């Protein structure tokens with residue numbers, strides 16, 4: 001029993017974190033085989049990054065893996081990431097993939113400073129392609145990931161904090177999530193929405209954990225629920241969402257559109273002083289997969 | 297910016313997790329130097345554990361570290377933990393300590409099944425000496441820990457789930473936290489209370505992160521605040537608590553008894569539909585140390 005914001009064990013990623021310094025700028029890099037990946041803004045001092053990199057050489061990059069200095073033998077840019085070829089393959093390289101995630105999906109973040117891991121937490125990619133992380137100066141180059149069997153799927157590299165305190169970054173191919181750029185502009189997070197399928201998944205987790213007070217005998221139609229969703233700035237629920245919630249609905253015996261009638265009531269009436277899984281708000285940062293992981 | 301339930305990077309503990317089997321019972325053990333620590337209930341089939349262990353031999357214990365079988369060359373009991381001496385020292389043993397924690401303190405939990413780590417999360421030791429974990433059948437022997445510089449301070453080994461779904465266990469010397477025993481009885485979690493110094497720490501974290509709506513111009517006395525605390529089932533605030541909150545009060549310029557007047561108002565009036573650090577409840581599972589870790 002119980003339901004926590006649960007990250008993947010971070011060891012396989014800890015063994016890949018290094019420190020990258022260029023000039024007076026230090027941040028984190030990801031060392032996989034003989035390449036170190038890091039944000040290209042490490043080379044900054046409205047820049048043209050192609051010009052900035054042409055003016056650099058391998059010896060301008062200091063890469064440290066714990067106590068060991070790695071010798072850079074090549075450098076190149078891939079979108080907003082720099083690839084530093086080093087003369088040593090990381091012996092701790094896990095089986096890995098570079099995957100790009102969808103808004104509404106979750107991942108673990110290994111926050112790192114000066115190449116040294118500091119902490120691990122779970123995050124969701126918001127509909128507006130920001131993440132509500134916890135990051136300080138020096139955290140750039142920290143990565144987000146999921147782990148399946150022995151395989152690390154890297155999905156996020158940290159680049160910046162926006163004015164509202166939320167975070168923006170790239171996939172590991174250097175392509176930003178969302179309409180953001182690695183320069184100082186007035187860019188800001190756009191309007192957001194609540195991830196409906198995740199709220200439903202979390203209500204199923206609550207039922208599995210014995211919270212039942214919000215249940216009722218009613219069912220709704222998909223169309224009528226989506227009318228309520230749009231009033232409350234919730235994403236539309238699709239038939240694919242209903243299908244994805246199938247296992248949790250079978251586990252609890254509560255049909256998806258039955259649970260949707262509960263969510264409609266919670267949206268229109270609130271909780272009347274009660275809580276669900278220790279929260280007085282509707283939580284939307286757990287996917288159906290996340291619930292089954294802790295509540296099979 | 298941002299504030300998350302943030303665990304310590306779990307790699308140093310992942311390398312210590314093994315599978316212990318006795319008879320048909322499997323759970324997790326902690327392998328440090330040439331000893332594997334695990335819950336003594338692995339030897340059960342109102343037991344007398346001294347009798348149960350006298351009837352066992354080394355060959356009754358199967359210990360597997362990933363794919364490698366470790367040969368047990370000695371067995372002994374230490375309170376509610378079994379110590380299995382093995383013929384190989386763990387080459388991945390970190391610098392470590394066995395520390396016992398206080399109610400109100402926090403730690404990271406590496407949930408494990410069949411000797412294999414599944415997830416990492418942060419937990420607090422409740423005033424009633426339970427933890428609100430996330431644990432399933434097979435999770436016994438999972439451990440809780442904090443990490444400081446290179447040193448893992450192990451503080452918790454998981455033994456059982458109580459009827460309300462919360463969790464109970466021992467320190468790594470085998471001594472239970474709280475009035476619990478490793479037998480089936482009608483034991484249940486006792487009354488709990490809210491950890492006041494942690495709520496205050498989290499209000500300081502909120503201010504550091506730009507949430508200021510609950511602040512006011514008033515201050516209270518310690519005695520008058522503690523009258524309100526006892527009405528709302530909050531722990532008394534001590535002068536030592538006030539001293540511990542010193543750094544956060546200096547960082548924000550908000551005196552501790554100034555913030556106490558805010559907490560009094562929140563307790564008496566609620567939040568009027570507003571939120572603090574993404575919560576509509578007063579959070580008490582972050583220590584002052586946890587706040588400074590993410591909000592220096």
Ligand SMILES: CNC(=O)c1cc(Br)cc([N+](=O)[O-])c1N[C@@H]1CCCC[C@@H]1NC(=O)c1cncc2ccccc12
Nearest residue numbers: 041135136137138139140159160161182183184185297
């Ligand atoms: C704060 N400001 C921005 O983060 C920022 C804002 C914009 Br608009 C554009 C960029 N840009 O172009 O990269 C930014 N990156 C900064 C400047 C270039 C180098 C990296 C810098 N950021 C960090 O060090 C950082 C990361 N995370 C959380 C933080 C919390 C507090 C302070 C700093 C950070």
Ligand SMILES: CNC(=O)c1cc(Br)cc([N+](=O)[O-])c1N[C@@H]1CCCC[C@@H]1NC(=O)c1cncc2ccccc12
Nearest residue numbers: 001337431432433434435436455456457478479480481
């Ligand atoms: C559920 N019941 C108890 O956990 C229990 C309750 C009491 Br009262 C006393 C003991 N006792 O004496 O050890 C208990 N341990 C169980 C019996 C002895 C072996 C270990 C057993 N527990 C787990 O496998 C377990 C751990 N965590 C979360 C779980 C969630 C669901 C199912 C099982 C667990």
